[PDB]
């Protein structure tokens, strides 16, 4: 009624202490202020708005926020991007992200969807007004989404054009299956309670075959491309980890196994997710590098051939971090009431 959908310059707000030199906390010292000890969330009358998580501006604001952080904190000895290369230095730090709250300025208010099972698109009854986002960790992943929020009710599957195979699929789970990756040459590994992994994959298929008119859903390994979208990629406390899922996508097992062990590797030269380019980073020291994250949703891409056959094949996707921000920012929308 009185408000208008619009885009603005949202201001951040961590909790990071300046006593910690871990780059997150150091980056969070400026640009962003403290958290709300009593943040307000006012239930909007009893009307219902209509959101869209594929055309939000918070996503591109937060995409740029995190880009500065990475090229200000994790600076590559040499960063080569279309057009030119920039020679720098490579220090050794640690990476445990801080939950960040996003906050609209003077006049503007954040509209939020608390509708039980929402797919970030259209009708949204239970709407509300807040000044900040919520505790979201800015973790850069691929294939699986880690250290994030989980669905309250049923499992949510959601994209822009479900039917289109170019539109990336976001799988938001209802249970957080733990994972554990460690580096004890560079080769490291991971391990997953496959007993909960393939049992909570079962319901990811069942819900996925409710939008494809009870068809057949089969999972498969990535068709190919760049190593960061083939191999589940992330940054464990400083080094870039590429872990081969596969054994986690080889359809089947849904008494087969218990513990899964994806191999994995650590790369020092890698294609940037900031721009079309690549940059060499720094080796590590024997730190027994270990990340124990919460897998909480996956990035899948469908194949071309729906009507043809009685089945659909899905594969691990990603590459566009923007979708990584989209999975948590799916409920809020910027509004200007000035």
């Amino acid at each position: 009624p009185v408000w208008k959908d619009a885009d603005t310059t949202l201001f951040c707000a961590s909790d990071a202490k300046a006593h910690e030199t871990e780059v997150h906390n150091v980056w969070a010292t400026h640009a962003c202020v403290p958290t709300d000890p009593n943040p307000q969330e006012i239930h909007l009358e009893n009307v219902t708005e209509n959101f869209n998580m594929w055309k939000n501006n918070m996503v591109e604001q937060m995409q740029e926020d995190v880009i500065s952080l990475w090229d200000q904190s994790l600076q590559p000895c040499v960063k080569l991007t279309g057009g030119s290369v920039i020679k720098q230095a490579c220090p050794k730090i640690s990476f445990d992200p801080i939950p960040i709250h996003y906050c609209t300025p003077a006049g503007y208010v954040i509209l939020k969807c608390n509708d039980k099972n929402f797919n970030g698109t259209g009708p949204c009854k239970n709407v509300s007004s807040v000044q900040c986002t919520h505790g979201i960790k800015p973790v850069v992943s691929t294939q699986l989404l880690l250290n994030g929020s989980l669905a309250e009710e049923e499992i949510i599957i959601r994209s822009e054009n479900l039917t289109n195979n170019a539109k990336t699929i976001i799988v938001h789970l209802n249970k957080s299956v733990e994972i554990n990756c460690t580096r004890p040459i560079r080769k490291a590994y991971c391990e997953i309670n496959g007993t909960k992994w393939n049992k909570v994959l079962k319901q990811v298929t069942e819900k996925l075959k409710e939008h494809f008119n009870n068809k057949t859903i089969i999972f498969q390994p990535p068709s190919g491309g760049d190593l960061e979208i083939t191999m589940h990629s992330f940054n464990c406390r400083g080094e870039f980890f590429y872990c081969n899922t596969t054994q986690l996508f080889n359809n089947t097992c849904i008494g087969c196994n218990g513990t899964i062990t994806l191999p994995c590797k650590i790369k020092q030269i890698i294609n940037m997710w900031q721009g079309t380019g690549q940059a060499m980073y720094a080796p590590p020291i024997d730190g027994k590098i270990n990340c124990v994250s919460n897998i909480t949703g996956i990035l899948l891409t469908r194949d071309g051939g729906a009507n043809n056959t009685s089945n659909e094949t899905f594969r691990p996707g990603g590459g566009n971090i923007k979708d990584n921000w989209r999975s948590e920012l799916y409920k809020y929308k910027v509004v200007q009431i000035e």
Partner: antibody
Amino acid sequence: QVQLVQSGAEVKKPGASVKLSCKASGYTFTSYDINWVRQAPGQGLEWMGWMNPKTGNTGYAQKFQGRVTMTRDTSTSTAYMELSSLRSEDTAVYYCATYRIIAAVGYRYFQYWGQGALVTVSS
Amino acid sequence: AIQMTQSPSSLSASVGDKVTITCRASQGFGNYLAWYQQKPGKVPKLLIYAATTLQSEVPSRFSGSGSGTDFTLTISSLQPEDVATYYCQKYNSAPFTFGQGTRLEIKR
């Protein structure tokens, strides 16, 4: 018609504590927060703490971290703010305040100030 | 962080003069900058809110400028009714910190 009135002034001996009173009217005292701020004669403004009236969550400042203690009784629709271990540098005008009564957010400036209470700390 | 520093503590200013009271900070809080005025011996009342938006029933000689890290409160055509100290404050979220203060003169 939004009224936020205080009571009289107070004289207390060092280390005896004083409970300041605040009564608000003409709005939903349970909705909007209540802030407390003071001004020592020859002083500027110093914000003390905030309090959520429907669920008494309380936050204060580091400087006043520990002595301050805001409470409320919705039955009475009156806010409170004790200040124990009373030093005589803690003698100034203590006021309650609140914001623009709107069901919207971001409007958390103090638009309704109280009359003021003089807390004189001496024997 | 957040370090609000009101420029001057006291000023001269004829009558029907232009006075610019500056308010700076450490890190921006998204322009939710408030301007309060304390008339001597009175309780203070809100002037400008959200950086520039004037409050109802208040003279338009008061203008809230600046934004982000460097705000200003300007009064052109100063008069004897416009005297107290004007304190700048932040209200995005508690802690609702005020500035030191700024008291106005009259030159004479």
